[PDB]
Copies of this chain bind each other. A is one copy, B any other.
Amino acid sequence: QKITTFLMFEGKAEEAMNFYTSLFDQSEIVSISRYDENGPGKEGTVIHATFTLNGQEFMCIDSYVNHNFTFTPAMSLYVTCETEEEIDTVFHKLAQDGAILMPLGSYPFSKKFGWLNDKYGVSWQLTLA
């Protein structure tokens, strides 16, 4: 994999990864290293982790620096789902304590599409193929 999408959290990487890998088939945590007692990040937070979503590798970290930005909808994860059941289930899960940008439903451009930010602020688009 030459280009890997890389998510920078500020304390929630591990929780987020555990959540994401539960949503899709063939998704697992590959590797994870966590800060010990002497930092520079807070103890137990992610130094670096690699995980797959449906076989595709993603990376994340917990930043040891607080930044003045976070995730925006300008770079989003576009998910193509095989079935109505899958899109309904994944959307509802990702929507929990999230923010809806376009509610899941029918649009001129799509039989079934939605757009949200999840509870971590990560932007997801979901469509039925």
Contact = CB atoms under 8 A, between A and B. Distances in A.
Contact of A78 (B3, B24, B76, B121): B3
Tell me how many chains of this kind the complex includes: 2
Interface in A83-118: none
A4 B80 contact: yes
A56 B2 contact: yes
Greatest chain B CB density within 10 A among A3, A55, A70, A78 is at A3
Contacts of A3: 24, 53-54, 56, 77-79
Interface residues of A, number: 30
Contacts of A38: none
Nearest to A25: B2
Contacts of A71: 72, 74-75
A79 B2 contact: yes
Greatest chain B CB density within 10 A among A1, A8, A72 is at A72
A48 B71 CA distance: 22
Contact of A75 (B1, B6, B79, B125): B6
Interface of A: 1-8, 24, 53-56, 59, 67, 69-80, 121-122, 125
